[PDB]
């Protein structure tokens, strides 16, 4: 029941990443991909709790 808006660079390797996305550092967020011809396993699902 907590939301954390922390869109910073994830440090995976031992090399620090301060503002630069290196080989060992990746953004935690990745985008969606929606097409009308997609199947059941790729269709959007609007979820409310």
């Amino acid at each position: 029941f907590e939301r954390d808006i922390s869109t910073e660079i994830y440090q995976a390797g031992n090399k620090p990443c301060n503002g630069v996305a290196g080989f060992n550092c990746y953004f935690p967020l990745r985008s969606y991909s929606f097409r009308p011809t997609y199947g059941v396993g790729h269709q959007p699902y609007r979820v409310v709790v």
Partner: antibody, heavy 132, light 113 residues
């Protein structure tokens, strides 16, 4: 960037409507910018924008002339970046590249100067002419 | 503003011979962080520029291993192991600071047939 609109003959006292379009891409979480180029060798960065998801949008970087006469806005709903101006003193030939920065995270950035990583999404298709 | 001129002419490059282009920055870099902050670009005329080397000494955007930047401080340079017909285009070194972003002059590196 795949296709962009805008272009034609505009009087120096007129205004231009610049818009760059693209395909399915992370438009929201990337920082875009406008760069114009001379017919000879050499580009010239003319505008830039921030991203609302990372932080607030009150970190826009401007030069003197483009603060005086230019502005940049984003729709925040689709894949479209908008550049607007009102006054044209000396602007004959330019390309208005709809590039973007390779920085999905914003750190140690103020409203004056902070580094950017790289540009890899240059776009072409906007030609400007002034002659009537 | 940093004064920055690369080579405001056409530099002949013979095939099979390495070519190097150098630029110097009036202001010291690396003030924001320990990593070097300068990007290398290649702009072939007609369609679109292509990115080769980003900040530091690394590789990205599918750059061939022939391109390799080097140098630090007020001494910057490139190195291409083998030039090709697709290597024709203007080059720029661009530091990631100085928000009034002034640009340098491109260098033509056409193959000397």
């Amino acid at each position: 960037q795949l296709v962009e609109s805008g272009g034609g003959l505009v009087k120096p006292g007129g205004s231009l409507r610049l818009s760059c379009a693209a395909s399915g891409f992370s438009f929201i979480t990337y920082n875009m910018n406008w760069v114009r180029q001379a017919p000879g060798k050499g580009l010239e960065w003319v505008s830039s924008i921030s991203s609302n998801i990372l932080s607030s949008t009150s970190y826009i970087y401007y030069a003197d002339s483009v603060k005086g006469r230019f502005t940049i806005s984003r729709d925040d709903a689709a894949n479209s970046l908008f550049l607007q101006m009102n006054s044209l003193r000396v602007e004959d030939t330019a390309q208005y590249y709809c590039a973007r920065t390779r920085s999905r995270s914003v750190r140690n950035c103020t409203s004056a100067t902070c580094p950017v990583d790289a540009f890899d999404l240059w776009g072409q298709g906007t030609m400007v002419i002034v002659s009537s | 503003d940093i004064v920055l001129t690369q080579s405001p002419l056409s530099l002949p490059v013979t095939p099979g011979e390495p070519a190097s282009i150098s630029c110097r920055s009036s202001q010291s870099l690396l003030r924001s962080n320990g990593y070097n902050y300068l990007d290398w670009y290649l702009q072939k005329p007609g369609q679109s520029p292509h990115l080769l080397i980003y900040l530091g000494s690394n590789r990205a955007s599918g750059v061939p291993d022939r391109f390799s930047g080097s140098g630090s401080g007020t001494d910057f340079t490139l190195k291409i192991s083998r030039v090709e017909a697709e290597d024709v285009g203007v080059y720029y070194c661009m530091q990631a600071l100085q928000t009034p972003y002034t640009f340098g002059q491109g260098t033509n590196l056409e193959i000397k047939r």
